[PDB]
C-alpha cells in the first residue's frame, strides 16, 4: 500500500526483463559510469604522464592508435596511491594529464563487479535455487581485484596497475615477469593447470554428451532439434558415455554420478584461479617466485648454468629496459 512497499515489490520482482535487485541499486550506476567513461577515454583522451617524468604516453584512438595499441593509461607515478577524483584536480585538463580516468573507471568497476557478484546471489534466492553460482564468480573477481587493486597497493602506486588495453596488458605481463618471476611461482603454476585442465574437462565433457545423443532427428535437419525445451526426458545415454570413458582410460577413473561429474567441472578452474589470484597478491608485496640462479656448481665452485639461468637472462633484459627513464638509482625498489 505504501510507496516503499510498492517500490520494493518492483525492484525485487523476477518478472522484470533483467532482474535489478538490491545489488543492482549499486551495480547499474557503477558499471554504466565505468562504461560511459571507458568508451570516451578509449576513443578520445589526451596523452597521460604515466612515469611521472612528464613524458606523456598516448593511449586513445584519436591520437593515432588502433584496437591493439590503444589503452586507457594508468595514473601517474607523481600521484601514486593518492585518491585523485575530478573535484580534487582544479581543472579537467589537469585531471586528464595526470591519469585521471584510470581511477574513475577502476573504482567504479570493482564496485560494480562486486555488486554483479552479489546480484547473482540475490536472484538465486528469489528463484528457489541453491545459491552458489556467485562463489564460482568469485574467481575472476579475485583476479580482477588482484591486478587493478591489490597490486597497486603493495607496489604503492596505481601506475604499476594494469593498463586498460590490449598492448598494455602485455606491457603489464612482461614487466611483472622481470620484477617478480611469476612463471616460477607455484600459484601461476596452479592456475595454468587450472585453465589447461579447465579447457580439457570442458571439451572432454562436451564431447561425451554430444557423442551419446539419442536419435530424435533425421539426417536432413539439425542435430540440436532433438531437444525440445523444458522436456523431462534425458537427452543422452549417460550409461553409454560412461562405458566409453570406462574403457578409454580404465574403469575406476570414470564418474558414473553426473552430479559429482558436474561438480568437478566447477571445482578445478575456480580453485585454480583462487590460487592464482593469490599469486599476484603475494607477489604484490614482493614475495616473488622461486630463484634458482647460480644453484648448480661444480666441485671447483664455478657456476654451471641451468634453464633457470637462461630464464634469468631473459628477465635481466626486461628489468634493465622497463621504464627506461624513470629510474635513477641501481635497484628497482618499485
Amino acid at each position: 500500500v505504501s510507496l516503499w512497499e510498492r517500490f520494493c515489490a518492483w525492484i525485487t520482482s523476477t518478472e522484470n526483463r533483467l532482474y535489478i535487485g538490491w545489488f543492482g541499486c549499486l551495480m547499474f550506476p557503477t558499471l554504466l559510469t565505468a562504461t560511459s567513461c571507458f568508451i570516451i577515454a578509449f576513443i578520445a583522451a589526451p596523452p597521460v604522464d604515466i612515469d611521472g617524468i612528464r613524458e606523456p604516453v598516448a593511449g586513445s584512438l584519436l591520437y593515432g592508435n588502433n584496437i591493439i595499441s590503444g589503452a586507457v593509461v594508468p595514473s601517474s607515478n607523481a600521484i601514486g596511491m593518492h585518491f585523485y577524483p575530478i573535484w580534487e584536480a582544479a581543472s579537467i585538463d589537469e585531471w586528464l594529464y595526470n591519469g585521471g580516468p584510470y581511477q574513475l573507471i577502476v573504482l567504479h568497476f570493482l564496485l560494480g563487479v562486486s555488486a554483479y557478484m552479489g546480484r547473482e546471489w540475490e536472484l538465486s534466492y528469489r528463484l528457489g535455487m541453491r545459491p552458489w553460482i556467485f562463489v564460482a564468480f568469485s574467481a575472476p573477481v579475485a583476479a580482477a581485484s588482484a591486478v587493478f587493486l591489490v597490486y597497486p597497493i603493495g607496489q604503492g602506486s596505481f601506475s604499476d596497475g594494469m593498463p586498460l588495453g590490449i598492448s598494455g596488458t602485455f606491457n603489464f605481463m612482461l614487466v611483472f615477469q622481470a620484477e617478480h618471476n611469476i612463471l616460477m611461482h607455484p600459484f601461476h603454476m596452479a592456475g595454468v593447470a587450472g585453465v589447461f585442465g579447465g579447457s580439457l574437462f570442458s571439451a572432454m565433457h562436451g564431447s561425451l554428451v554430444t557423442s551419446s545423443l539419442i536419435r530424435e532427428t533425421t539426417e536432413n535437419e539439425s542435430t540440436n532439434y532433438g531437444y525440445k525445451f523444458g522436456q523431462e526426458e534425458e537427452t543422452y545415454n549417460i550409461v553409454a558415455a560412461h562405458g566409453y570413458f570406462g574403457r578409454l582410460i580404465f574403469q575406476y577413473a570414470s564418474f558414473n554420478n553426473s552430479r559429482a561429474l558436474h561438480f568437478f567441472l566447477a571445482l578445478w578452474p575456480v580453485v585454480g584461479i583462487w590460487i592464482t589470484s593469490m599469486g599476484i597478491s603475494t607477489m604484490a608485496f614482493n614475495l616473488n617466485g622461486f630463484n634458482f640462479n647460480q644453484s648448480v656448481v661444480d666441485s671447483q665452485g664455478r657456476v654451471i648454468n641451468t634453464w633457470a639461468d637462461i630464464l634469468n637472462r631473459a628477465n635481466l633484459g626486461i628489468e634493465v629496459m622497463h621504464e627506461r627513464n624513470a629510474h635513477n638509482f641501481p635497484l628497482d625498489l618499485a
Binding site: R17, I43, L61, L62, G64, N65, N66, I67, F229, G230
Partner: peptide, 30 residues
C-alpha cells in the same frame, strides 16, 4: 580517417549485442 573505421567496428559490435539481448527468440515450452 583511419580511426573512423575502428569506431564503426566497435559501436557496430555493440549494436548486435543490444539486439541479441532484447530481441532474442524467446524459448517456449510446448
Amino acid at each position: 580517417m583511419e580511426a573512423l573505421v575502428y569506431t564503426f567496428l566497435l559501436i557496430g559490435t555493440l549494436m548486435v549485442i543490444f539486439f541479441a539481448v532484447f530481441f532474442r527468440e524467446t524459448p517456449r515450452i510446448l
